[PDB]
Design a binder for this molecule. Structure first.
Ligand SMILES: *[C@@H]1O[C@H](CO)[C@@H](O[C@@H]2O[C@H](CO)[C@@H](O[C@@H]3O[C@H](CO)[C@@H](O)[C@H](O[C@H]4O[C@H](CO)[C@@H](O)[C@H](O)[C@@H]4O)[C@@H]3O)[C@H](O)[C@H]2NC(C)=O)[C@H](O)[C@H]1NC(C)=O
Ligand SMILES: *[C@@H]1O[C@H](CO)[C@@H](O[C@@H]2O[C@H](CO)[C@@H](O[C@@H]3O[C@H](CO)[C@@H](O)[C@H](O)[C@@H]3O)[C@H](O)[C@H]2NC(C)=O)[C@H](O)[C@H]1NC(C)=O
Ligand SMILES: *[C@@H]1O[C@H](CO)[C@@H](O)[C@H](O)[C@H]1NC(C)=O
Ligand SMILES: *[C@@H]1O[C@H](CO)[C@@H](O)[C@H](O)[C@H]1NC(C)=O
Ligand SMILES: *[C@@H]1O[C@H](CO)[C@@H](O)[C@H](O)[C@H]1NC(C)=O
Lengths: 511, 478
């Protein structure tokens, strides 16, 4: 195939994938393995991370009167620090340990920490991104981590569910700011910890706030039947107390079959809109848009009935503000009964709660009930497992990965109108991983399946010989120069021709 | 000693000569000689700090600096903490006084002026039992670098602390709590006694900030075939040395939406500690608790409740008031008042929520009407001290001045501890049945046996306690 450029097949099962934004090097974290590659998927280094003797009943220092056995080391976190050139990789062994490796050569270990940081399960989620935070005012970055309670060890209670963690050499991976009664940390209470689990899907930072996209039970008490919802966890980055820990539910609702709720989110991607799309959402082109793929789920299991939903962060911030304003006006219950018993919202004299509200002592851990709602621009007959968005062309194109191994491209012209223009298999029979990232120019996209990584070209207009094929492909990247017989984008044609119909799009004209 | 009704008095220290009273924006040093103010220390919340309090949804009467923790440090320094309009602060006054340190007090001092909290300054260290959050949903027991598990309901489930005692290298905490102990709990309230070692230094590694010795036991203040439980503890007393037995006296009441009733119970200090030696429901002080195992510390954090309940002295309440209009609220004891026969009786003072003080003793008549020993309550007097509706918050006894200080929200009143001098009639002196008052027959005066000297073989003095009150009167001739 000519659309797929490089293919790298690995020996183990792959877990994560990131691209260095300035050097374009590729880092792949997998089971018992850890690989570094060049921008063309040429292997540079490979690191054996397992297996090692380990039991879930034991920590590194003590092993109760239980035997350590060789167990696999599933990679759970893969991150790059920009200020200090060093790679962060966390494994499942030893209660979720992180190592700090050199960026030029991942084989080198620079710092080994013993702190329990990450889920020690093979399937329990863990989401980690680096963004501004305390202790100092936001000149130092921290690691925001969200971990699911694996429920397999007594040492697991020690690990928070959401926490900020320091990147200082002296205090590596410790909670960033902690005091007697408060800190940069949220635990799930002893009564809900073993029953109410939280699945962390995606994490991102946008406009002085840290975000987590989660799936979880709507209710903690057993008074109601089990319903799974998608939530959005937020914290102010200046906040060194998590006074601003807040959640609102996320609904992706459809007209079809009466009421259809795509309750289970599968993957998320934060990106920028196009000229046309920014007008529909009522935002500037420099603003952020959240792209996410939701799947209707039988219980907690996603079905083959997915949908693509977009959310602007102006409406996300205005929905958080809507839930916060309402609590501080005394209406309703604070929520988040699975942290501590839910007490009523207090009436407050607060007069200037805005989008930047950063939290106070009162109504502090707030659980919003008013959801942010969106109607999907596209629906699909397969389970969608990844999402990525680029606006190199004048239009936004969303790249979507299939659990069956297919890559689909959707072009989004409005909050209402969008449709597929391409669809092909990258690794047939192999679910596409959630970590799917572009090249630095957004010209190639890295698609990772179970055991392979494929460098896929974002557009190829040269393979359209005749012109009815160029405009017929309905590719937003492809137009047709009148003079030369080449299909190519606008920049490739020469406006030397007198007629403005030198380059024509697939919907603006006829060839 | 009268103040407004708006302030809220809390005895923060008491001697037989002086008492310290924390109030709305001041703390008083008051002489027990005439309930006269001797010294004062004012400490007002700043206008910005108390505008923040009203901003967060509180009222004017809540946004004040209610002084609620006092402790004289071993160097002559003075530790003084206040609520500071739901922003608790602690200060260090050094000598009069001058401010030497000011710092946050979250976890060291309540936010609300309610009688919800307690503390004990034991061996130069403050043990605090309060809330650490503005919203009042994070109860803890805190010492220097050691606290209970945040939001762990198996250790503390919405508690109201009533007292704290230092004893034998432990610190005991008395409180009522929500019941999650029984698998079929339904918003029931039970009363606990908790314990922490004073030489606790935290567990190893991550446990280094939490107690390795916190254990609690239920208190049993029940009434036979038809049991009757008083499950909400209201007030305790200091440890009372009644002969060879150390005792703690407590007031209990029934829950709301139940048969209204109050009781007084007493628990041996040895019975309290012995309960921590039995089974756990599904603690020894080691020199370095940081040497314990993760297995051991995690165990005690998952089994903080003992199985056995602390039994009561005589196995029943010493006084009961069921289906009456008023409820008992405070307790104080004058121990070991030697009667005319030479028997020692503890005299018990319990105040009601409508301003009365009940005085009584207990007599353990051996086989008076059956083969099982029968305990009887002898009520000496139940008089009105405070105006008809005002709740008695605390009681402080001064055996020296023969005075009983009654503490309400905005006043202190003193009454006589023993009324021997006041009565002049023979019937009254014997009907009173106070173990300390007896009628002389040479002198017509009803005399106080603390200052008098009987000799066991003289028919001079006359006293009747075991009989009925009318039977005591028949002993009076003519
Ligand atoms: C603290 O101590 C007090 C007193 O020591 C204690 O009160 C006692 O409680 C028990 C049970 O709560 C009472 O025992 C009852 O005795 C009668 C016989 O008179 C039994 O019939 C009772 O029930 C049994 O048999 C029933 C037959 O219908 C069955 O339905 C039932 O299942 C039982 O098999 C029961 O045994 C006892 O009378 C009181 N004693 C007094 C003096 O009140 C209190 O329970 C203690 N508290 C704690 C927390 O330990
Ligand atoms: C409440 O006020 C009273 C009276 O002002 C205080 O009592 C006084 O306290 C001081 C300081 O402890 C006593 O001075 C000391 O006297 C002893 C005895 O000689 C001496 O050894 C010390 O070096 C020091 O000088 C003073 O005597 C005492 N006065 C009386 C009449 O008792 C009381 O301390 C105040 N309350 C509190 C809690 O401090
Ligand atoms: C622990 O590792 C050793 C290798 O040093 C291995 O031989 C042994 O089998 C492991 N333990 C168990 C219980 O298998
Ligand atoms: C990278 O690190 C490994 C292990 O220390 C070493 O063998 C290798 O020589 C280093 N450099 C390169 C270019 O591989
Ligand atoms: C983890 O997930 C994989 C794929 O869904 C499954 O094959 C495996 O059995 C799971 N392991 C556990 C312990 O559930």
């Amino acid at each position: 195939n000519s659309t797929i450029t490089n293919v790298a097949a690995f020996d183990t099962k792959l877990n994560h994938l990131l691209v260095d934004t300035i050097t374009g090097r590729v880092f792949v974290g997998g089971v018992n393995r850890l690989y570094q590659l060049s921008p063309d998927l040429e292997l540079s280094e490979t690191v054996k991370t397992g297996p090692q003797n380990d039991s879930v009943e034991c920590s590194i220092l003590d092993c109760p009167l239980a035997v350590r056995s060789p167990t696999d080391n599933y990679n759970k976190v893969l991150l790059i620090d920009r200020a200090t050139s060093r790679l962060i990789a966390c494994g499942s062994l030893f209660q979720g340990t992180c190592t700090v490796r050199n960026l030029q050569n991942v084989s080198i270990i620079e710092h080994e920490v013993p702190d329990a940081v990450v889920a020690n399960d093979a399937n329990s989620s863990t989401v980690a991104f680096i963004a501004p935070g305390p202790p100092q005012h936001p000149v130092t970055n921290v690691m925001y981590v969200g971990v699911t309670y694996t429920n397999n060890s007594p040492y697991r209670s020690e690990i928070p569910a959401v926490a900020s963690r320091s990147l200082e050499k002296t205090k590596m991976f410790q909670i960033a700011s902690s005091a007697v009664t408060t800190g940069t940390r949220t635990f799930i209470n002893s009564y809900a910890r073993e029953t109410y689990f939280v699945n962390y899907v995606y994490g991102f930072s946008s406009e002085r706030f840290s975000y987590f996209l989660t799936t979880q039970l709507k209710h903690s008490h057993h008074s109601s039947p089990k319903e799974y919802i998608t939530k959005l966890v937020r914290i102010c980055q200046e906040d060194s107390n998590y006074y601003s820990y807040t959640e609102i539910p996320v609904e992706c609702i459809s007209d079809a079959q009466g009421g259809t709720k795509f309750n289970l989110v599968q993957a998320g991607f934060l990106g920028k809109p196009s000229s046309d799309l920014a007008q529909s959402l009522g935002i500037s082109i420099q603003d952020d848009v959240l792209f996410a793929v939701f799947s209707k789920g039988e219980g907690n299991t996603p079905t083959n009935n997915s949908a693509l939903c977009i959310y602007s962060l102006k409406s996300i911030r205005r929905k958080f503000m809507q839930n916060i304003k309402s609590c501080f006006n005394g209406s309703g219950m604070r929520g988040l009964d699975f942290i501590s018993p839910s007490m009523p919202c207090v009436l407050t004299k607060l007069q200037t709660i805005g989008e930047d509200f950063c939290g106070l002592d009162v109504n502090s851990p707030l659980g919003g009930e008013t959801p942010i709602t969106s109607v999907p621009v596209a629906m699909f007959n397969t389970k969608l497992t990844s999402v990525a968005a680029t606006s190199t062309s004048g239009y936004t194109v969303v790249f979507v990965g299939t659990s069956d191994g297919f890559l689909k491209k959707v072009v989004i012209e409005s909050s209402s109108i969008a449709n597929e223009y391409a669809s092909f298999a990258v690794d047939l029979g192999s679910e596409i991983n959630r970590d799917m990232q572009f090249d630095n120019q957004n010209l190639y996209i890295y698609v990772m399946s179970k055991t392979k990584v494929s460098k896929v070209k974002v557009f190829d207009c040269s393979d359209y010989k005749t012109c009815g094929d160029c405009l017929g492909a309905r590719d937003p990247y492809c137009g047709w120069c009148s003079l030369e017989n080449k299909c190519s984008p606008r920049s490739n044609c020469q406006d030397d021709a007198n007629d403005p119909l030198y380059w024509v799009s697939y919907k603006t004209g006829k060839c | 000693f009268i103040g407004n009704s708006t302030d809220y008095f809390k005895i923060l220290d008491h001697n037989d000569e002086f008492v310290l009273v924390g109030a709305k924006d001041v703390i008083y040093n008051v002489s027990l000689n005439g309930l006269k103010e001797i010294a004062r220390l004012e400490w007002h919340s700043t206008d910005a700090d108390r505008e923040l309090c009203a901003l967060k949804g509180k009222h004017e009467w809540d946004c004040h600096n209610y002084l609620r923790v006092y402790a004289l440090r071993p160097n002559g320094e003075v530790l003084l903490c206040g609520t500071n309009s739901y922003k608790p602060r602690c200060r260090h006054y050094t000598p009069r006084y001058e401010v030497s340190r000011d710092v946050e007090a979250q976890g060291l001092c309540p936010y609300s002026p309610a009688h919800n909290s307690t503390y004990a300054f034991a061996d130069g260290h403050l043990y605090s039992a309060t809330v650490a959050d503005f919203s009042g949903g994070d109860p803890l027991i805190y010492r220097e670098n050691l606290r209970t598990e945040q939001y762990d309901l198996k250790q503390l489930n919405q508690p109201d602390f009533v007292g704290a005692i230092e004893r034998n290298g432990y610190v005991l905490f008395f409180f009522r709590e929500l019941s999650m102990e029984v698998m079929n709990f339904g918003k029931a309230v039970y009363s606990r006694v908790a314990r922490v070692c004073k030489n606790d230094r935290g567990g190893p590694y991550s446990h280094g900030k939490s107690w390795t010795s916190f254990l609690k036991a239920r208190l049993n203040c029940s009434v036979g075939e038809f049991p009757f439980y008083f499950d909400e503890i209201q007030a305790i007393s200091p440890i009372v040395e009644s002969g060879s037995k150390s005792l703690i006296y407590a007031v209990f009441t029934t829950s709301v939406n139940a048969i209204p009733g109050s009781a007084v119970c007493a628990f041996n200090v040895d019975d309290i500690l012995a309960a921590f030696d039995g089974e756990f429901k599904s603690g020894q002080c080691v020199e370095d608790s940081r040497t314990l195992t993760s297995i051991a510390v995690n165990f005690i954090k998952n089994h903080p409740l003992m199985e056995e309940a602390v039994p009561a002295v005589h196995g029943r309440p010493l006084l009961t008031k069921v289906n009456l209009h008023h409820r008992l609220t405070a307790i104080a004891v004058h121990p070991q008042v030697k009667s005319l026969s030479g028997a020692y009786y503890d005299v018990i003072y319990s105040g009601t929520d409508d301003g009365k003080v009940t005085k009584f003793i207990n007599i353990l008549s051996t086989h008076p009407n059956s083969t099982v020993d029968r305990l009887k309550t002898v009520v000496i007097s139940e008089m009105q001290v405070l105006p008809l509706g005002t709740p008695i918050r605390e009681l402080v006894i001064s055996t020296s001045k023969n005075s009983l200080v009654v503490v309400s929200d905005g006043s202190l009143v003193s009454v006589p501890l023993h009324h021997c001098s006041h009565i002049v009639d023979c019937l009254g002196c014997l009907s009173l049945q106070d173990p300390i008052c007896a009628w002389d027959l040479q002198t017509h005066e009803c005399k106080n046996l603390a200052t008098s000297q009987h000799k066991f073989g003289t028919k001079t003095y006359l006293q009747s306690l075991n009989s009925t009150k009318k039977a005591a009167a028949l002993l009076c001739p003519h």
